[PDB]
Design a protein around this motif. Sequence first.
Motif, PDB file in Angstrom:
ATOM      1  N   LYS A  26      47.664  59.344  26.609  1.00  0.00           N
ATOM      2  CA  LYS A  26      46.374  58.869  27.086  1.00  0.00           C
ATOM      3  C   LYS A  26      46.553  57.830  28.181  1.00  0.00           C
ATOM      4  N   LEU A  27      47.492  56.918  27.979  1.00  0.00           N
ATOM      5  CA  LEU A  27      47.760  55.867  28.944  1.00  0.00           C
ATOM      6  C   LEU A  27      48.168  56.462  30.273  1.00  0.00           C
ATOM      7  N   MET A  28      49.044  57.449  30.216  1.00  0.00           N
ATOM      8  CA  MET A  28      49.448  58.179  31.399  1.00  0.00           C
ATOM      9  C   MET A  28      48.229  58.689  32.135  1.00  0.00           C
ATOM     10  N   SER A  29      47.434  59.500  31.462  1.00  0.00           N
ATOM     11  CA  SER A  29      46.226  60.063  32.060  1.00  0.00           C
ATOM     12  C   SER A  29      45.286  58.965  32.576  1.00  0.00           C
ATOM     13  N   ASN A  30      45.412  57.763  32.021  1.00  0.00           N
ATOM     14  CA  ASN A  30      44.612  56.631  32.463  1.00  0.00           C
ATOM     15  C   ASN A  30      45.126  56.084  33.782  1.00  0.00           C
ATOM     16  N   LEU A  31      46.422  55.834  33.818  1.00  0.00           N
ATOM     17  CA  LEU A  31      47.064  55.196  34.956  1.00  0.00           C
ATOM     18  C   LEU A  31      47.303  56.214  36.051  1.00  0.00           C
ATOM     19  N   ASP A  32      47.974  57.291  35.660  1.00  0.00           N
ATOM     20  CA  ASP A  32      48.270  58.435  36.515  1.00  0.00           C
ATOM     21  C   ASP A  32      46.967  59.052  37.024  1.00  0.00           C
ATOM     22  N   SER A  33      46.406  58.424  38.046  1.00  0.00           N
ATOM     23  CA  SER A  33      45.142  58.841  38.624  1.00  0.00           C
ATOM     24  C   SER A  33      45.381  60.014  39.554  1.00  0.00           C
ATOM     25  N   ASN A  34      46.602  60.073  40.057  1.00  0.00           N
ATOM     26  CA  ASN A  34      47.065  61.200  40.844  1.00  0.00           C
ATOM     27  C   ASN A  34      47.263  62.406  39.923  1.00  0.00           C
ATOM     28  N   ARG A  35      47.255  62.147  38.613  1.00  0.00           N
ATOM     29  CA  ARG A  35      47.363  63.174  37.585  1.00  0.00           C
ATOM     30  C   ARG A  35      48.415  64.221  37.907  1.00  0.00           C
ATOM     31  N   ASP A  36      49.635  63.745  38.033  1.00  0.00           N
ATOM     32  CA  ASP A  36      50.807  64.600  38.119  1.00  0.00           C
ATOM     33  C   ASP A  36      51.658  64.324  36.890  1.00  0.00           C
ATOM     34  N   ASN A  37      51.139  63.398  36.082  1.00  0.00           N
ATOM     35  CA  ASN A  37      51.723  62.999  34.808  1.00  0.00           C
ATOM     36  C   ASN A  37      52.965  62.155  35.006  1.00  0.00           C
ATOM     37  N   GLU A  38      53.013  61.496  36.151  1.00  0.00           N
ATOM     38  CA  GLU A  38      53.994  60.464  36.410  1.00  0.00           C
ATOM     39  C   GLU A  38      53.283  59.283  37.060  1.00  0.00           C
ATOM     40  N   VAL A  39      53.371  58.130  36.427  1.00  0.00           N
ATOM     41  CA  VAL A  39      52.649  56.937  36.889  1.00  0.00           C
ATOM     42  C   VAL A  39      53.357  56.263  38.063  1.00  0.00           C
ATOM     43  N   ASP A  40      52.650  56.090  39.175  1.00  0.00           N
ATOM     44  CA  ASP A  40      53.234  55.463  40.367  1.00  0.00           C
ATOM     45  C   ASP A  40      53.249  53.938  40.231  1.00  0.00           C
ATOM     46  N   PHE A  41      54.028  53.252  41.081  1.00  0.00           N
ATOM     47  CA  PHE A  41      54.103  51.782  41.060  1.00  0.00           C
ATOM     48  C   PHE A  41      52.709  51.172  40.979  1.00  0.00           C
ATOM     49  N   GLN A  42      51.833  51.672  41.834  1.00  0.00           N
ATOM     50  CA  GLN A  42      50.472  51.172  41.940  1.00  0.00           C
ATOM     51  C   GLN A  42      49.695  51.432  40.655  1.00  0.00           C
ATOM     52  N   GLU A  43      49.750  52.654  40.151  1.00  0.00           N
ATOM     53  CA  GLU A  43      49.083  52.996  38.895  1.00  0.00           C
ATOM     54  C   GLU A  43      49.657  52.164  37.743  1.00  0.00           C
ATOM     55  N   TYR A  44      50.923  51.804  37.889  1.00  0.00           N
ATOM     56  CA  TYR A  44      51.636  50.980  36.930  1.00  0.00           C
ATOM     57  C   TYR A  44      51.125  49.544  36.991  1.00  0.00           C
ATOM     58  N   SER A  45      50.981  49.036  38.207  1.00  0.00           N
ATOM     59  CA  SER A  45      50.540  47.672  38.415  1.00  0.00           C
ATOM     60  C   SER A  45      49.068  47.532  38.072  1.00  0.00           C
ATOM     61  N   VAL A  46      48.279  48.551  38.409  1.00  0.00           N
ATOM     62  CA  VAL A  46      46.851  48.574  38.101  1.00  0.00           C
ATOM     63  C   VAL A  46      46.641  48.522  36.597  1.00  0.00           C
ATOM     64  N   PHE A  47      47.552  49.148  35.876  1.00  0.00           N
ATOM     65  CA  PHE A  47      47.555  49.074  34.429  1.00  0.00           C
ATOM     66  C   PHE A  47      47.700  47.629  33.979  1.00  0.00           C
ATOM     67  N   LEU A  48      48.747  46.979  34.469  1.00  0.00           N
ATOM     68  CA  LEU A  48      49.018  45.584  34.124  1.00  0.00           C
ATOM     69  C   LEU A  48      47.859  44.701  34.550  1.00  0.00           C
ATOM     70  N   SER A  49      47.283  45.062  35.678  1.00  0.00           N
ATOM     71  CA  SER A  49      46.091  44.428  36.193  1.00  0.00           C
ATOM     72  C   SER A  49      44.991  44.484  35.150  1.00  0.00           C
ATOM     73  N   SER A  50      44.702  45.702  34.705  1.00  0.00           N
ATOM     74  CA  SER A  50      43.685  45.941  33.702  1.00  0.00           C
ATOM     75  C   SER A  50      43.989  45.157  32.434  1.00  0.00           C
ATOM     76  N   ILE A  51      45.265  45.053  32.084  1.00  0.00           N
ATOM     77  CA  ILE A  51      45.676  44.271  30.926  1.00  0.00           C
ATOM     78  C   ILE A  51      45.188  42.836  31.042  1.00  0.00           C
ATOM     79  N   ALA A  52      45.623  42.162  32.101  1.00  0.00           N
ATOM     80  CA  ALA A  52      45.268  40.768  32.322  1.00  0.00           C
ATOM     81  C   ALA A  52      43.756  40.602  32.420  1.00  0.00           C
ATOM     82  N   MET A  53      43.091  41.581  33.027  1.00  0.00           N
ATOM     83  CA  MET A  53      41.631  41.581  33.117  1.00  0.00           C
ATOM     84  C   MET A  53      41.003  41.634  31.727  1.00  0.00           C
ATOM     85  N   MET A  54      41.330  42.680  30.981  1.00  0.00           N
ATOM     86  CA  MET A  54      40.714  42.932  29.681  1.00  0.00           C
ATOM     87  C   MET A  54      41.050  41.828  28.691  1.00  0.00           C
ATOM     88  N   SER A  55      42.306  41.392  28.691  1.00  0.00           N
ATOM     89  CA  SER A  55      42.734  40.293  27.836  1.00  0.00           C
ATOM     90  C   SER A  55      41.895  39.056  28.135  1.00  0.00           C
TER      91      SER A  55
END
Lengths: 101, 101
Positions: A57-86
């Motif tokens: 699920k996290l993959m499909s969340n971050l992997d917006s390019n949906r190739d099922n591999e999370v890019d640096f940006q999708e990775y950082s946006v994740f961490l971004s969302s973490i700090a945001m939501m927290s």
Amino acid sequence: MASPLEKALDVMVSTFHKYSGKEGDKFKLNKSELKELLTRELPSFLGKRTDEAAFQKLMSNLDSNRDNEVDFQEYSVFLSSIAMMSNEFFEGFPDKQPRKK
Amino acid sequence: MASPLEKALDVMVSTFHKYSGKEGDKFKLNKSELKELLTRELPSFLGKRTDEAAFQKLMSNLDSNRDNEVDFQEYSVFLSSIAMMSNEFFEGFPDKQPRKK
């Protein structure tokens, strides 16, 4: 941001290429490398629930390019969302927000 | 994310309330505290150009609530954008991206 911690969030970007360039893409985390990176680099976040479904699920969340591999940006946006939501949940309810933004 | 570095990006959220709750809002960085936090906690990023105009524009960038005090979230989203931009510009051109997203 902070002291060397600032530059260390930059190091979190480097954390990415550390796990990415092990298998699959060197700029994207395939589920395999994503798993390890999440488990190992997000003990708090993902260590709360390191199940395959979570990664999937996290993959499909971050992997917006949906190739099922999370890019640096999708990775950082994740961490971004973490700090945001927290944060907005740190209040319990985003009161610092215009509740629309 | 990473080792304790992960939890340290969480500490960057705490870095915020460190500077915020000095003057003005305790959940938002007024220009004054924003300046200090940027200069001190983003030596690399903002230390590249710590001018009042920079803070002023940066504020208006982050401060989406436009009260001229940056909230934890607007603060983290900034750092988010940093890691993002540093990344997609690390390639020089976002090739990991679908160039649309």
